[PDB]
Design a protein around this ligand. Structure first.
Ligand SMILES: Nc1ncnc2c1ncn2[C@@H]1O[C@H](COP(=O)(O)OP(=O)(O)OP(=O)(O)O)[C@@H](O)[C@H]1O
Lengths: 230, 148, 308, 143, 79
RNA sequence: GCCGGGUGAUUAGCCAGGCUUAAAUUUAUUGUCCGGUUUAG
């Protein structure tokens, strides 16, 4: 999220290098007509479109029942099998927690997301804090994110690392600025509360792609909006 | 909570003249009133009802402590993984504590599966106890149940 | 006695020294530096007058505080090459990092460790040390002091502080055939036994709480690697045969530069820029210049070396 | 496209229409020789109707330029795919979900062996409980 | 204020009502939030990014100024 | 088998055209004006 003097380093075709090249070019030229026709923008567009979004791996430490565990997820389909009490839902909530910060930074930067509830920390005596970390790979671009919370009553601090998500979300906002109908990734979560979402105001006249970005979960009024959209 | 309070009072005893103590509490409330009005009158009537209940003192074979044990063992029959269930009083409130393995859990930390069974069985037993206060074993009444 | 030596060395009178003692924790400058890629970094650096008095204190304290031999950072006659020589003949490698290592060092820990070494110091000396080697960020009411990096006295202090942790981990790793080394706030383990490096993250976590409270492990920078993928330790690549290397990309980086130089297509500053890289590569390999002369000839290389 | 996508998961139905009632609009299905209202549907058909309709709406809204919006990328999380579905429908839900949206990453948790009969070994993770070093812990094992 | 038009002169009075709300809130309690500019009041034109309101209060020889602004969703820069 | 890694030699040379070799699912190269290391005036 900086202009920088474009340090040469060595030749590469990374998406980040194209992002920096465009930022450096923008700081000099003022006419938007020339900017919209620059070859750097075309290269950035092509690289962004070719990349396929998919999560790579995840690890959990001292969160709910799970003590220490690391999973690697496929790129098309993955299924978890177990009986009751084996933390099948816990993994899903961990992924939702991680994805919420990415959702938040797209609408507007430096906006907080979802934290860890105080009762979700492990109940063992020797535990001190809980941490969740994850990695997102865009073909050849790798980002990582850590979320953590300290147990109540302790007097030692911990922080979150949000540089990767902020940097990745800045690219999406920049490309959205110069493209009329740029696409955005899809994120959704169908919890167990959907059973009565379908089981169970001022008229809307304006729709937009950011309407689906208000929340990451599906519940209640979303069903009503579907009828009004149809 | 009420069942546990009655069981604790019966088991610990030391109530002495419980009916007289409740009547004295009612008299103190009336004196304070002489020295919101409808609520105070209702509370005084509740104190009189408590005095009448203590004066009665059925102390039947199916006492409060026996019903409490039967209810807890009834729920524990359906959940073999757990060990014991207790009602812990702290911060001027009551909370349910369950022990699984070596970790104690609150009510809200259980999974959906044990939540369903705990709710359904507890609601089954509550109505049987309330509807049949005369039988020695209250889990023998008649009825019809529809489950989907 | 330390106040007397400083006063005599710099010829400070009582009033000026007293004023400097009070104002010292605020004589710092904060600035940003560019990042390799996108972003920025924040650095705090003291003034000229405080720097050359911090160096004197470090010189006085260096021959009295023991430092473990496994720490290969800010040490005399030690560098990256010595660090990488330990893991050059092992199959599996694991790397871990800390989280905000420098700003978690506080005078309470430093003085607690200083009392354990048996060195007795007066109250005046303790007051002088506390108000000279630490930085006070935020408002004057913060009453918090952190070490911070960018000052000449920080790197030496950190090594002394982590002595107990270094000693405790060294003899635990020796008993299980694991090679361990530390550089600043980076820790590396390597071994040949399969399915043995999955147990150390819990061990280090338990050791950190016991030996140095406050510190914590960054869980998003843990790396496992073997002979089937890329392997490097603090910037030097290890070939599967077991030899140090700079990398194929850098070798072709330099070869083209010299070839273009032979045609007279290089600028003035590029020659100076490349000469340092050649010297560093020759230091790592030891035979880079021979391979260059066997291709372009000794006359051109000697002219390039003496150019400028 | 939206109507046919919904009809793909409910083969027993013929067509869906949006009758404009004098007071208000209403949607009319047709099962067999009978005309049904959405309020009169069973619980199972309601769950599929809401899930597929919501996914189609989100994909269409987020991908305006694409000729076929269903190809958009993303990630979808689903819990307990086997709610209110008889075993006959349990064996074909996964392949239909994957075929309709081919570029979307799916994370699914299941509870019954009927689904496990139609999943490749590559995409199966099994949770287990193992006491190691005197401390109980959870492990994941590939088939 | 005199004149007929479609933008509506009440909008001007509404702008003043927003600014004075902040002054009242801080008097009640320190750093109490006031009234924000909600999303849909911004202009719908293509070449707009944000909306701003500037005001100044004078007390004899004491001058203060306040600026309140809000940017559209998905903007590159926040205000 | 396959894919991904290591690189001496190769070319008006950071692209490419060849020969070798390595493997549990398992690296995607970093911070200067301070500190110590290399080379020079
Ligand atoms: N703070 C905690 N300490 C210890 N164990 C906890 C804590 N919070 C939750 N648990 C454990 O979490 C378990 C339930 O986890 P979870 O709901 O993820 O599993 P599940 O039954 O597979 O999920 P679901 O039925 O919701 O799909 C309980 O058995 C309980 O022991």
């Amino acid at each position: 999220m900086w202009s920088h003097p474009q340090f040469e380093k060595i030749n590469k075709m990374n998406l980040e290098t194209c992002y920096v090249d465009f930022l450096e070019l923008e700081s000099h030229v003022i006419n938007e007509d020339y900017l919209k026709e620059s070859v750097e923008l075309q290269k950035l567009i092509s690289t962004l479109n070719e990349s396929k979004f998919h999560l790579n791996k995840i690890g959990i430490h001292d969160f709910k029942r799970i003590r220490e565990l690391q999973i690697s997820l496929e790129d098309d389909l993955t299924v978890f099998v177990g009986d009751n009490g084996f933390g099948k839902s816990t993994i899903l909530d961990a992924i939702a927690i991680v994805l919420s910060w990415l959702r938040s930074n797209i609408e507007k930067e430096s906006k907080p997301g979802t934290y860890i509830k105080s009762h979700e920390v492990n109940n063992s005596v020797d535990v001190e804090y809980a941490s969740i970390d994850a990695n997102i790979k865009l073909k050849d671009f790798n980002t990582s994110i850590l979320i953590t919370k300290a147990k109540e009553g302790a007097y030692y601090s911990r922080n979150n690392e949000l540089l990767g998500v902020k940097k990745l979300a800045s690219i999406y906002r920049l490309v959205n600025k110069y493209v009329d109908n740029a696409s955005l990734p899809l994120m959704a979560y169908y919890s167990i509360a959907r059973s009565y979402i379908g089981g169970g105001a001022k008229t809307k006249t304006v729709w937009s792609k950011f309407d689906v970005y208000d929340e990451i979960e599906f519940d209640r009024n979303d069903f009503t909006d579907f009828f009004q959209w149809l | 909570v009420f069942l546990h309070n009655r069981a604790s009072q019966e088991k610990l005893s030391e109530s002495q003249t419980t009916i007289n103590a409740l009547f004295s509490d009612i008299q103190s409330l009336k004196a304070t009133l002489t020295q919101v009005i409808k609520g105070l009158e209702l509370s005084l009537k509740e104190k009189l009802n408590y005095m009448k209940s203590l004066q009665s003192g059925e102390h039947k074979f199916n006492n409060a402590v026996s019903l409490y044990d039967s209810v807890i063992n009834t729920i524990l029959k359906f959940l073999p993984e757990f060990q014991w269930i207790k009602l812990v009083y702290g911060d001027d409130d009551y909370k349910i504590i369950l022990k699984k393995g070596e970790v104690e859990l609150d009510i809200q930390q259980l999974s959906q599966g044990e939540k369903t069974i705990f709710t359904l069985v507890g609601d089954l037993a509550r109505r049987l106890i309330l509807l049949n206060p005369n039988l020695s074993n209250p889990l023998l009444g008649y009825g019809i149940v529809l489950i989907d | 006695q330390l106040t007397s030596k400083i006063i005599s060395k710099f010829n400070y009178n009582r009033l000026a020294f007293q004023l400097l003692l009070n104002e010292a924790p605020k004589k710092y400058k904060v600035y940003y530096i560019p990042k390799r890629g996108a972003g920025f970094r924040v650095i705090a650096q003291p003034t000229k007058e405080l720097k050359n008095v911090q160096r004197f204190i470090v010189s006085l304290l260096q021959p009295k505080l023991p430092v473990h031999h496994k720490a290969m950072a800010y040490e005399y006659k030690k560098s990256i090459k010595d660090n990488a020589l330990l893991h050059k003949d092992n199959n599996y490698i694991l790397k871990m990092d800390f989280q905000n290592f420098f700003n978690k060092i506080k005078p309470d820990i430093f003085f607690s460790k200083l009392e354990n070494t048996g060195l007795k110091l007066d109250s005046f000396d303790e007051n002088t040390l506390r108000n000279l080697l630490f930085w006070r960020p935020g408002k004057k009411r913060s009453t918090t002091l952190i070490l911070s990096v960018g000052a000449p006295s920080s790197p030496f202090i950190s090594n002394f502080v982590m002595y107990d942790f270094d000693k405790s981990l060294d003899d635990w790793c020796r008993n299980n055939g694991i090679t361990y080394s530390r550089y600043a706030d980076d820790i590396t383990f390597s071994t040949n036994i399969k399915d043995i490096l999955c147990r150390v993250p819990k061990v280090v976590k338990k050791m950190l709480s016991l030996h140095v409270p406050g510190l914590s492990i960054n869980e998003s920078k843990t790396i496992f690697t073997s002979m089937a993928h890329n392997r490097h330790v603090t910037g030097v690549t290890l070939t599967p045969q077991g030899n140090l290397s700079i990398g194929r990309d850098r070798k072709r980086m330099l070869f083209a530069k010299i070839h273009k130089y032979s045609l007279g297509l290089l600028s003035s500053e590029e020659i100076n820029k490349t000469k340092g890289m050649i010297a560093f590569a020759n230091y790592l390999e030891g035979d880079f210049l021979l391979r260059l002369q066997k291709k372009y000839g000794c006359e051109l290389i000697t002219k390039f070396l003496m150019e400028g | 496209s939206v109507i046919n996508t919904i009809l793909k998961f409910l083969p027993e139905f013929q067509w869906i229409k949006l009758v404009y009632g004098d007071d208000d609009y209403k949607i009319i299905l047709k099962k067999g020789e009978v005309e049904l209202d959405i309020q009169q549907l069973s619980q199972g058909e309601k769950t599929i109707f809401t899930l597929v309709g919501d996914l189609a709406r989100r994909l269409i809204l987020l991908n305006p330029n694409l000729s076929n919006p269903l190809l958009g990328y993303g990630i979808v999380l689903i819990d307990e795919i086997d709610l209110h579905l008889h075993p006959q429908w349990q064996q074909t839900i996964i392949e239909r979900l994957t075929s309709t949206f081919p570029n979307v990453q799916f994370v699914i948790t299941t509870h019954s062996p009927q689904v496990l009969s139609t999943v490749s070994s590559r995409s199966v993770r099994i949770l287990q409980e193992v006491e190691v070093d005197g401390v109980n812990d959870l492990i994941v094992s590939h088939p």
